[PDB]
Amino acid sequence: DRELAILATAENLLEDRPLADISVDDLAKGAGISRPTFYFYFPSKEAVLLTLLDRVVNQADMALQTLAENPADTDRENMWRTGINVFFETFGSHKAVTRAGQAARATSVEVAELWSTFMQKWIAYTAAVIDAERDRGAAPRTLPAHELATALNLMNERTLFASFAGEQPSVPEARVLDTLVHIWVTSIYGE
């Protein structure tokens, strides 16, 4: 409960400044508690980011499980769009956590490992689906499915996050979904 308060406060404060510029004291008063009461719920401001990013990533993950268990009744282009869109919408709704999470991969081993565990899972799911499409005679046996899936997933990570942070250069947010779908569909079905 106070736990949700510290989390919401961190997400809000990260909408306006980096983690380096937010104090434990800043998070404490935000949730309406003392510095020492803060330390009962979290070991550090860094563990607060790790928890937010845990929640964002698991939300993406569950949303993609829900898609996998309940296929959308559509063509191959839309099957892939619906999947990429889990990442667009989920992270797109949590840009501050997304951006702060990505910078913490450099400094925090737990953040790096969390990102790494989920990226390995999403790449493995992507490759299994390409393999199914190949077994069905729907896609040609070009590159190793897992090598292809790895590059395409790395493209979506870099390209979504550049867009969300308004980096230069970046695809504009309103064009990025279509851009990625074109590259997935041409690279998975092209000869």
Residue 85 contacts which entry, ligand GHQ, a copy of itself, none (Cβ below 5-8 A, type-dependent): none
To the nearest whole angstrom, how small is the minimum distance from the Cβ of residue 87 to ligand GHQ? Answer: 4
Choose which of 81, 126, 139, 176 interacts with ligand GHQ (CB under 6 A): 126
Residue closer to ligand GHQ, measured from CB, 9 or 126: 126
What does the binding site for a copy of itself look like in residue numbers (CB under 8 A)?
A: 103, 106, 116, 119-120, 123, 142-144, 147-148, 150-155, 157-159, 162, 167-172, 175-176, 178-180, 182-183, 185-187, 189-190
Q: Rule CB under 6 A: is residue 110 a binding residue for ligand GHQ?
A: no
Structure tokens at 149: 């899936």
Structure tokens at 51: 């928890």
CA 108 from centroid of its chain's CA atoms? 17
To the nearest whole angstrom, how small is the minimum distance from the Cβ of residue 37 to a copy of itself? Answer: 32
To the nearest whole angstrom, how small is the minimum distance from the Cβ of residue 59 to a copy of itself? Answer: 21
DSSP string computed for 103-158:
HHTTT-HHHHHHHHHHHHHHHHHHHHHHHHHHHTTSS---S-HHHHHHHHHHHHHH
Residue 169 contacts which entry, ligand GHQ, a copy of itself, none (Cβ below 5-8 A, type-dependent): a copy of itself
Omega of the bond leading into 169 within 30 degrees of 0 (cis): yes
- Contacts (Cβ under 8 Å, ≥6 apart) of 65: none
C-alpha gyration radius of the chain: 19
Taking CA atoms, 171 is separated from 92, 93, 159, 161, 175, in Å, by 14, 17, 7, 10, 6
Residue 70 contacts which entry, ligand GHQ, a copy of itself, none (Cβ below 5-8 A, type-dependent): none
Stretch 56-85 residues interacting with ligand GHQ (CB under 6 A)? 83-84
To the nearest whole angstrom, how small is the minimum distance from the Cβ of residue 152 to a copy of itself? Answer: 7
Binding site for ligand GHQ (CB under 6 A): 83-84, 87, 122, 125-126, 153, 156-157, 160
